[PDB]
Design a protein around this ligand. Structure first.
Ligand SMILES: *[C@@H]1O[C@H](CO)[C@@H](O[C@@H]2O[C@H](CO)[C@@H](O)[C@H](O)[C@H]2NC(C)=O)[C@H](O)[C@H]1NC(C)=O
Ligand SMILES: *[C@@H]1O[C@H](CO)[C@@H](O)[C@H](O)[C@H]1NC(C)=O
Ligand SMILES: *[C@@H]1O[C@H](CO)[C@@H](O)[C@H](O)[C@H]1NC(C)=O
Ligand SMILES: *[C@@H]1O[C@H](CO)[C@@H](O)[C@H](O)[C@H]1NC(C)=O
Ligand SMILES: *[C@@H]1O[C@H](CO)[C@@H](O)[C@H](O)[C@H]1NC(C)=O
Ligand SMILES: *[C@@H]1O[C@H](CO)[C@@H](O)[C@H](O)[C@H]1NC(C)=O
Ligand SMILES: *[C@@H]1O[C@H](CO)[C@@H](O)[C@H](O)[C@H]1NC(C)=O
Lengths: 108, 173, 53, 173, 173
């Protein structure tokens, strides 16, 4: 004879969370809050380009090291790009006090 | 089945239907079929919309610059700024992780709640006219067509429609 | 490497999608950014449990 | 109506009564009227008292001085102290905002729970002696005076009082 | 008795049994006795295990060195580092205190939920065959031995076993 039943959804899915009372807990649908990924690029903000040094230090950039392109046309930019170990420090060495402070002032 | 259904009196889910997260399964002489409850389903999903908007939006992400650097005569400030940043990092980490755990629990309870509510709504029409069976389902001492199905979906039955047929077909049991 | 592509937040390991609130990826950032954690993953449930039989 | 009542089997609230957040509405030959359930209402409101004391008090507000200032050779410390303070501000902001959302939800569920509990208490006395009707109400197969009302309020009925009158007035139905 | 039982329809707990947090009390001609429900009890306690692991582990405790010190020409950094540390201290304090309150509430609700679920499981077998009584208990219109007890524990009854004995012993009432 006739019957009525409740119903709800399942699917083929096997995506999982952690939860208070059980782990790897499977659900139908999920959403990742996280961005665990990076494109592996140096893109630019907004249409505003960044500054690039290539091999140079900030000393070689600001002072006018001839092997560093001065690039006066670079009037403003999005962010500064270095490497960790900048090749071209000062050709005639010398202490450069408050490197920290100058960098922080030239954050932006 | 916090509140008694899902791994409760119900054991498992169904892959037959995909149009909505909730519904009914109708069974009568014309055939069987699954059919989704877009009313309560859409209301709940609107709740999830307001949730996730009310999680994402509650940040304010500044036009930020993180990093700093120091010489080796600034080690006060180095171990500070490390302690500072690691403190903040850990606090966002801890609070957000707990928030994912708790919010997903409350989401499970929200769903469980909604189906339990609907289960009582199904019960409330058909109390003596049709019986609890097994789990998940009710059997009718009378018969029901697709009009009777869609009527019972939207919260309508006409209680005296088959009150007498249940009054007779009960009485062999 | 450096590229003409566009973004809203940036870090040395790459340019970043500013859509979502969080990364676990690297703390240093510039721009309109996520926030860092030390974690593996964070995934809210939309749907619910999956059991066939 | 998380748990099935308020926008559940009940549709809406009532402005007739103001003395307490919960109650009953009595209907008999002497007349109609509303009357509040100060027992459970007062217990719940004591719960809200302990809540709000347990939200406000959990701060410790120091005899504080916020502000600082710097020259332009301290920009490490300026952008630091900005980052520091904005970090703290945002964390209190985020945690407290989530706390208002969650606590108000749990308050709604607390209320919904209490009325559901009381609904089963009303049911537990009058199970076969009087019937579920419609929503929100029970009909008696017998009669009930104001003494019967106030008795049924405080958790007392005398089950065999009108067991037989319901046993007869049922049987036409 | 958030959900209706504990200080709800049930008034208080029992010291007779210690083997498990939940169970039944059986009463028949052979005697009385208490007996624990290790299935649901063990599942719940596994939940508490995953909880407390998921509270403790979520910290990361560095190989840390807290303290600092300063002269009296560093008072910027002194009142800073005081403000810094007191800020962090208070935030961990506030969040953790709220977390103890909330988690213990959700634990109470978890327990209350589980017993309510089990109460409906006890109901689901013995619906018309045996009646609600008082609070906390069901009376049988038929008889039940220790095999019937242990069967009813693990989710088994054989509904037509004593369907007729209840069908007759009801009918004097
Ligand atoms: C940055 O430094 C690298 C050093 O690795 C330079 O590499 C040299 O490139 C030239 C051709 O341009 C070659 O003749 C050299 O043999 C390379 N040397 C090495 C060690 O790879 C690179 O030219 C520098 N770039 C700038 C812009 O200064
Ligand atoms: C599950 O189903 C979805 C939708 O049909 C599909 O995208 C996915 O590849 C399927 N996965 C498996 C393992 O079948
Ligand atoms: C989830 O964890 C439980 C822990 O015992 C284990 O039994 C199960 O196999 C795990 N599943 C997956 C997919 O990791
Ligand atoms: C409910 O369904 C019945 C048929 O099943 C239909 O006639 C009626 O118009 C529907 N009512 C609403 C409010 O949708
Ligand atoms: C950024 O993320 C959003 C959401 O995940 C997505 O819609 C968009 O396509 C993504 N864009 C890029 C460039 O990754
Ligand atoms: C309960 O109400 C009845 C009358 O309705 C009254 O006689 C009795 O004293 C009341 N009991 C308590 C404990 O208030
Ligand atoms: C349940 O209990 C009955 C007796 O009470 C026993 O015969 C049966 O094997 C048990 N089943 C399980 C799955 O434990």
């Amino acid at each position: 004879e006739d019957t009525i039943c409740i119903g709800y959804h399942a699917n083929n899915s096997t995506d999982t969370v952690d939860t208070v009372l059980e782990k790897n807990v499977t659900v139908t649908h999920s959403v990742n809050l996280l961005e665990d990924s990076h494109n592996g690029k140096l893109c630019l903000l907004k249409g505003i380009a960044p500054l690039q040094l290539g091999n140079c230090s900030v000393a070689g950039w600001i002072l006018g090291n001839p092997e560093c392109e001065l690039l006066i046309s670079r009037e403003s930019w999005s962010y500064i790009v270095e490497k960790p170990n900048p090749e071209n420090g000062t050709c005639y060495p010398g202490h450069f006090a408050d490197y920290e402070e100058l960098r922080e002032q030239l954050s932006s | 089945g916090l509140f008694g259904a899902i791994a409760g009196f119900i054991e498992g889910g169904w892959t037959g239907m995909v149009d909505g997260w909730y519904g009914y399964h109708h069974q009568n002489e014309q055939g069987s079929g699954y059919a989704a409850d877009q009313k309560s389903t859409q209301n709940a999903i609107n709740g999830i919309t307001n949730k996730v908007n009310s999680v994402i939006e509650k940040m304010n992400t500044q036009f930020t610059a993180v990093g700093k650097e120091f010489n080796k005569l600034e080690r006060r400030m180095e171990n500070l700024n490390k302690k500072v940043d690691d403190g903040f990092i850990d606090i966002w980490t801890y609070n957000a992780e707990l928030l994912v755990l708790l919010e997903n629990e409350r989401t499970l309870d929200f769903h469980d709640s909604n189906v339990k509510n609907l289960y009582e709504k199904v019960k409330s029409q058909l109390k003596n006219n049709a019986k609890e069976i097994g789990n998940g389902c009710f059997e009718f001492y009378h018969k029901c067509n697709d009009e009777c199905m869609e009527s019972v979906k939207n919260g309508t039955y006409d209680y005296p429609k088959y009150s007498e047929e249940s009054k007779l077909n009960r009485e062999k049991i | 490497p450096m590229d003409e592509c566009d973004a809203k937040c940036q870090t040395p390991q790459g340019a970043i999608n500013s859509s979502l609130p969080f990364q676990n990826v690297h703390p240093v950032t510039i721009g309109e950014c996520p926030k860092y954690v030390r974690s593996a993953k964070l995934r809210m449930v939309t749907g619910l449990r999956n059991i066939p039989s």
